[PDB]
Amino acid sequence: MEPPPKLVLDLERLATVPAEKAGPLQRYAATIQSQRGDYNGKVLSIRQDDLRTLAVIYDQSPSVLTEQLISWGVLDADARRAVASHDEL
Q1: 45 phi, psi to nearest 5 deg
Q2: Cα–Cα distances in Å, from 61 out to 31, 35, 36, 42?
Q3: How far from each other are the two terminal CA atoms of the chain, in whole angstroms?
Q4: Do residues 75 and 7 touch, judged by C-beta distance below 8 A?
Q5: Looking at the record's lineage, which domain of life comes first (predicted)?
Q6: 1-89 belongs to which CATH class?
């Protein structure tokens, strides 16, 4: 039983990302944090399955959505090994 990585999104990195795509997420994160209490500030950690929620919000395919966060540097590509349940088939 190995601990699967959580998706840690850097909120400050996200603040440096243009509002076109960052805005909705900056709002999402702020709302989650404020209602939880917040002791994260810089980094928000969500679930792999919880990431699919964001795909709906921006109306993006999960695959492309995952690559977005990685591309912006808000998430690491190291997380991809958790998204993939099994390599190949």
Answers
A1: -110, 125
A2: 23, 27, 28, 26
A3: 21
A4: yes
A5: Bacteria
A6: mainly alpha
